[PDB]
Write an enzyme that holds these catalytic residues in place. Structure first.
Site, short mmCIF file in Angstrom:
data_model
loop_
_atom_site.label_atom_id
_atom_site.label_comp_id
_atom_site.label_asym_id
_atom_site.label_seq_id
_atom_site.Cartn_x
_atom_site.Cartn_y
_atom_site.Cartn_z
N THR A 704 13.78 -79.72 -11.76
CA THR A 704 14.72 -80.67 -12.64
C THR A 704 14.53 -80.84 -14.21
O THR A 704 13.23 -80.21 -14.48
CB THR A 704 14.67 -82.52 -12.74
N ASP A 705 15.56 -81.74 -15.08
CA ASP A 705 14.60 -81.93 -16.71
C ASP A 705 13.46 -82.43 -16.12
O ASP A 705 14.05 -83.68 -14.87
CB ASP A 705 15.98 -81.89 -16.90
N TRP A 706 13.30 -82.69 -17.01
CA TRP A 706 12.11 -83.44 -17.71
C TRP A 706 11.88 -85.18 -17.15
O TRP A 706 12.73 -85.44 -18.53
CB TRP A 706 10.90 -82.99 -18.59
N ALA A 708 14.49 -86.36 -15.25
CA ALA A 708 15.55 -86.54 -14.93
C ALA A 708 15.83 -87.75 -14.27
O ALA A 708 14.63 -87.69 -13.05
CB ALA A 708 16.36 -85.18 -14.51
N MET A 734 10.24 -82.53 -12.26
CA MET A 734 9.27 -82.09 -12.75
C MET A 734 9.86 -83.25 -13.83
O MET A 734 10.48 -84.00 -14.38
CB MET A 734 10.04 -80.85 -13.79
#
Length: 794
Positions: A704-706, A708, A734
């Site tokens: 994932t983006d941080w 997310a 993440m």
């Protein structure tokens, strides 16, 4: 032991800068003459923009070489010190605004008001004026088409006009993350205009090289420059924080302009000039229909008076058929070596048919869900840019060829009207609109029919991840050892600044519990970003040029060379995964993060991404392609829904990522903060399983983006629905503060208990993570066969 030679790293980055600057206009005022005195205007001269703002703009450095310092160090010119001191004294009372917290640094700085006295006095004791206009960019907001953003400020316009009046020699440099308005600059009419982008910490050195003629500029535009923001086909459907309909479809950038609106282009895609002139002569052409390739040759000759490089660009015009087509699509390019005056280079390219196939998302060709070449004449063009490309050859197909059979995936969940090319009597093409068909995919059934098989657990097994790496046992036999706790833990990244890995990095993954580390699963370290290592400890690292500058080189080899040094630098810092390349398409010029991406064109996009990855792979480090997919707008990025056709996804937005996999050997992907076709990307099965793995054959990890959000389709987004994440084969959340303690209170084990998540799905993710982890330098550290790096020459 391997030496990282810092001076060679500098020279590699410097070469990228000197190949990536784009000369747009010049009457002979550039290059600067030996012994010239230069007056430099623009207060941004003292605070050179080395990068954008945000996650990819926080590389700590000891020193930044700006443009004035670069020029002084060149020993080719001198700088008017009186004028420098005027700017310095003014700036003591008007300090550079660094902002207050995340995303608050302004994207320009107030310009110093100039008087006739200052400008006249400067002209009296110098030979040439250089005016620097500065813009930065970044996460969470987009450019506005207003003064101080996309447009010049009033004070910048005044500066330009005064300088123009008093100096007979005037150069304008754009120290910008992304392109800005050129209309007023063009009306003022400087003698030369160059885009210098943001060149990292040695940017001034490479920029001085081109300004002084030590290097002849050879960069080319990776986007089309049109006269107005409202001319861009996406502008009508861009900037809504809730939902944007990609109505332009495949007609993004030059795919629109060259097809429908040539007269709205100021500078075409692939445009850039040099201190010399070149002649491209079209050459031999053959086609091999059975191999699905053609082979095209041309010769590029330097017909001017100084040495330089040029770029041969090859385009295909497909027959309109039933689907409709852009006039021209880029299929190959090659930058020459340095050519002396009167010398030439023969360029030959072999082009697979898949580079110019079309995705039939309606069934009108008879091959629904396939890449196809419709029957008709295919014409190949070569030249200096898309506009100035001329017929190389042609071939005709009497029947459609299917290049690849795929499936209905990631299709829109609501209908909208898209652009469609329509032929006129005179041979011209016009825009008409047609309804995009709505998805009929049974997603529930697709997941169930493709469910992986559970591996029966065996806690007495003492197999190490080393035994899988050695070939001694299958990954399936090893993974049987993981308990339900271990499975729930391994899909959690820990960070930011996990104690398990180098301080001040983005995440640790894999070996995130004592039990997982006891199986010889290493803690693998992730760190931003595309332009260099972001170390929140304050530790310094190499700050490299921005993404758009890299792509403007049109030179995968110079990019690969630079990132080969980064490969060693990462090992030195024990960082295994650099969080780049950023490679979302430039859908609209106003997108805030365009600076760290590459192009409006998917082939260039994928080819530049692949070069970066190849560089990182040199010594066994790696990158993470991001953000998968359609993160083309910053405003509303936690929630916004991109509604886009399968054809546009397949040909434009996914295509660069496909190339990163197949050409770049990409083994790590990051999803987005936002929604594509009506649900969040982190839980999208079609994106992360059907397309990425089952169609493209990716073998690797998805993260994932941080922090997310994730959802089940139609459900509410949360930051702890790891079950939905795992059901899509997005392997890694993440990030969490403490993975072993389940600090995010995620639903992996509860959903497993309730039969809503299958253990086989968790095991599939665990196997992806372990297979990735065992080939990293972190694994090699456990086995004592890692590379030790020593930095020389500081």
């Amino acid at each position: 032991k391997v030496i990282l030679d810092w001076n060679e790293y500098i020279e590699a980055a410097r070469s990228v800068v000197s190949e990536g600057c784009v000369l747009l206009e010049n009457n002979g005022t550039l290059p600067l003459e030996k012994g010239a005195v230069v007056s430099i205007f623009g207060r941004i001269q003292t605070h050179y923009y080395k990068s954008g703002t945000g996650s990819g703009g926080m590389v700590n450095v000891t020193h930044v070489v700006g443009v004035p310092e670069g020029l002084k160090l060149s020993e080719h010119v001198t700088v008017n010190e009186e004028l420098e001191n005027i700017y310095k004294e003014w700036e003591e009372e008007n300090p550079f605004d660094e902002g207050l917290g995340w995303g608050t640094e302004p994207w320009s700085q107030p310009e110093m008001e100039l008087t006739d006295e200052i400008v006249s006095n400067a002209s009296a004791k110098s030979d040439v004026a250089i005016v620097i206009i500065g813009r930065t960019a970044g996460e969470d907001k987009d450019f506005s088409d207003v003064a101080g953003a996309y447009k010049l400020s009033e004070t910048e316009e005044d500066m330009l006009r005064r300088v123009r009046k008093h100096f007979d020699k005037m150069v304008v440099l754009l120290n910008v993350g992304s392109l800005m308005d050129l209309n007023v600059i063009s009306e003022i009419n400087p003698d030369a205009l160059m885009v210098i982008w943001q060149g990292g910490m040695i940017g001034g050195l490479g920029t001085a090289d081109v300004l002084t003629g030590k290097v002849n500029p050879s960069g080319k535009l990776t986007d089309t420059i049109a006269y107005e923001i409202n001319d861009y086909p996406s502008t009508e459907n861009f900037g809504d924080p809730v939902r944007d309909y990609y109505a332009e479809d495949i007609y993004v950038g030059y795919r629109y302009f060259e097809t429908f609106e040539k007269s709205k282009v100021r500078y075409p895609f692939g445009y850039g000039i040099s201190y010399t002139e070149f002649e491209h002569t079209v050459g031999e052409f053959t086609a091999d229909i059975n191999s699905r390739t053609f082979t095209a040759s041309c010769t590029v000759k330097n017909t001017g008076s100084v040495a330089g490089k040029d770029v041969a660009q090859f385009y295909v015009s497909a027959p309109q058929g039933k689907l409709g087509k852009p006039e021209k699509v880029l299929v190959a390019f090659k930058k020459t070596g340095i050519l002396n005056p009167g010398k030439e280079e023969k360029i030959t390219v072999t082009v697979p048919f898949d580079r110019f196939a079309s995705f039939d998302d309606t069934g009108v060709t008879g091959a629904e869900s396939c890449f196809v070449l419709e029957a008709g004449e295919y014409t190949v063009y070569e030249g200096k840019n898309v506009r100035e490309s001329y017929k190389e050859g042609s071939f005709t197909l009497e029947e459609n060829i299917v290049t690849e059979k795929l499936s209905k995936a990631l299709a829109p969940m609501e209908s909208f009207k898209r652009m469609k090319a329509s032929e006129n009597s005179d041979g011209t093409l016009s825009v008409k609109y047609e309804d995009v068909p709505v998805s009929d995919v049974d997603e529930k059934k697709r997941r169930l029919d493709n469910m992986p098989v559970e591996i029966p657990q065996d806690f007495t097994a003492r197999y190490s991840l080393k035994d899988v790496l050695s070939g001694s046992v299958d990954m399936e036999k090893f993974i049987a050892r993981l308990s339900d706790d271990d499975l729930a833990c391994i899909v959690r990244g820990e960070g930011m600044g996990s104690s398990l890995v180098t301080a001040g990095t983005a995440a640790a993954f894999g070996g995130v519990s004592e039990y997982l580390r006891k199986m010889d699963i290493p803690a693998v370290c992730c760190d931003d970003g595309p332009s260099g290592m972001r170390l929140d400890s304050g530790a310094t690292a190499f700050s490299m040029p921005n993404g758009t500058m890299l792509a403007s080189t049109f030179n995968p080899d110079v990019i690969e060379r630079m990132y080969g040094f980064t490969s060693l630098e990462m090992i030195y810092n024990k960082v295994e995964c650099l969080l780049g390349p950023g490679m979302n398409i430039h859908r609209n010029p106003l997108n805030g993060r365009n600076f760290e991406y590459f192009s409006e064109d998917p082939y260039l996009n994928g080819t530049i991404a692949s070069a970066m990855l190849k560089g990182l792979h040199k010594y066994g480090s790696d990158g993470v392609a991001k953000h998968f997919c359609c993160n083309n707008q910053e405003l509303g990025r936690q929630a916004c829904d991109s509604v886009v056709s399968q054809r546009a996804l397949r040909e434009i937005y996914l295509k660069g990522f496909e190339i990163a996999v197949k050409e770049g050997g990409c083994k790590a992907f990051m999803t987005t903060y936002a929604q594509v076709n009506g649900m969040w990307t982190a839980g999208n099965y079609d994106l992360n399983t059907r397309i990425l793995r089952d169609e493209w054959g990716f073998k690797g990890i998805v993260m994932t983006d941080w922090w997310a959000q994730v959802n089940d389709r139609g459900g509410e987004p949360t930051k702890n629905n790891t079950a939905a994440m795992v059901r899509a084969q997005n392997d890694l959340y993440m990030v969490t503060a403490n993975a072993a303690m389940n600090s995010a209170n995620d639903n992996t084990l509860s959903q497993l208990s309730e039969g809503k998540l299958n253990r086989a799905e968790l095991q599939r993710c665990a196997m992806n993570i372990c297979e990735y982890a065992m080939n990293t330098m972190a694994m090699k550290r456990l086995c004592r066969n890692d590379i030790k790096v020593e930095i020389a020459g500081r």
